[PDB]
Ligand binder design. Sequence first.
Ligand code: HEC
Ligand code: HEC
Lengths: 135, 135
Amino acid sequence: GLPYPEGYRFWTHVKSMELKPGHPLYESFGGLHHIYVNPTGLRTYLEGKKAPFPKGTVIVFDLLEAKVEGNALLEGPRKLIGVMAKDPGRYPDTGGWGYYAFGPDKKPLAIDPKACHACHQGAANTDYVFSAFRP
Amino acid sequence: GLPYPEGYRFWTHVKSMELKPGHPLYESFGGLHHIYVNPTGLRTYLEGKKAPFPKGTVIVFDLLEAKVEGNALLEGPRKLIGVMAKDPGRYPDTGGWGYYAFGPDKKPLAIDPKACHACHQGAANTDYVFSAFRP
Ligand code: HEC
Ligand code: HEC
């Protein structure tokens, strides 16, 4: 159990990306998402994720509906947030990362953190984090 | 002359929006843009822009190329930033706003601030700012 990452909305914006129909991740994470990182984790991003994220890092995957209206992509309603929280001693079986998810009402969502980490093991080279900070 | 808003990338993310071909603003601002606001201006956004932004507010319109690859919208190279800086006494003829623009190399771009403000007068009711903070 991790408390809702209150205030993540004001953290540093790392990158954005829209997953469109047909994308292999559309069914789970389809829509427009923004990634945010708290102060503790930001420097590791800025240096290119060549060292592990420190304990206390929190990263939030903010997933929104993608609305297409009048030659524009608009932010629709929030779908969910995904959260990764670094604590090597607390999460030894998922690479030191605590995987969590919350709905738009801020209530926890039932997830399988082992399944989150299974895919994120593809990014083991950069401490299990896919996104790169976009200047 | 306004100095480049160094560090805006770490300010609060207000909203995002993609302008697609055919949009009336595509030729000038086509692509994926993110809006950021410095601490001074953030509270006015959070309260719904019912009062004027305070002196010292800086808002940045960060415009990126929109890349469509493999059922995804990806952030492409930066195109430009637009900047609005609140100083009622400094900019009396543009509603207290200083309009500025910078290229990807951080160098000023030659703009007509009166033309920026002419369109933003459409948002005079919310102190000449169109965007709303998206929770
Ligand atoms: C592959 C099948 C994945 C599964 C299962 C999970 N995630 Fe993931 N995640 C995936 C990708 C390709 C990305 C990068 C997105 C981008 O814009 O580049 C992410 C990102 C995240 C993040 C941001 C940090 C990062 O790794 O870049 C978080 C905080 C995150 N995802 C959380 C998360 C959770 C909680 C999951 C289980 C419910 C989960 N992910 C599964 C791919 C995949
Ligand atoms: C109409 C023809 C416009 C002209 C001319 C200029 N801008 Fe503008 N701007 C316009 C819209 C519709 C928006 C909202 C975008 C959104 O995502 O909702 C904006 C936004 C900005 C912002 C962000 C603050 C805000 O008003 O929401 C900035 C800092 C900004 N624009 C700068 C700017 C500059 C420097 C311009 C002249 C070079 C300029 N704008 C012209 C519409 C129009």
